[PDB]
């Protein structure tokens, strides 16, 4: 269950049902605390957007 005003321009493009992107190859090796910062933070806008 998606908000009513999530705009459609996300949907034509290959992306995620998550609100964020989730590519982990971006992060370093073995940095678990740094790789969680991609998935769950809300100060950092997405590696997508």
């Amino acid at each position: 269950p998606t908000p009513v005003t999530s705009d459609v321009a996300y949907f034509q493009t290959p992306s995620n049902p998550r609100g964020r992107a989730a590519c982990v190859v971006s992060c370093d090796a073995y940095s678990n605390e740094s790789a969680e910062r991609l998935l769950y933070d809300h100060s950092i806008p997405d590696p997508a957007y």
Binding site: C23, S26, C27, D28, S34, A35, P47, A48
Partner: protein
């Protein structure tokens, strides 16, 4: 008042610059944009 605006708006590592507030990109090297 300066403690208000920075809240409402917003180092090195091994000889290569590296910002702490991004643990990863996806769309290549994140460019900059400017104001006139």
């Amino acid at each position: 008042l300066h403690d208000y605006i920075k809240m409402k708006a917003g180092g090195y590592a091994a000889g290569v610059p590296r910002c702490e507030n991004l643990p990863g990109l996806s769309h290549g090297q994140l460019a900059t944009c400017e104001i006139i």
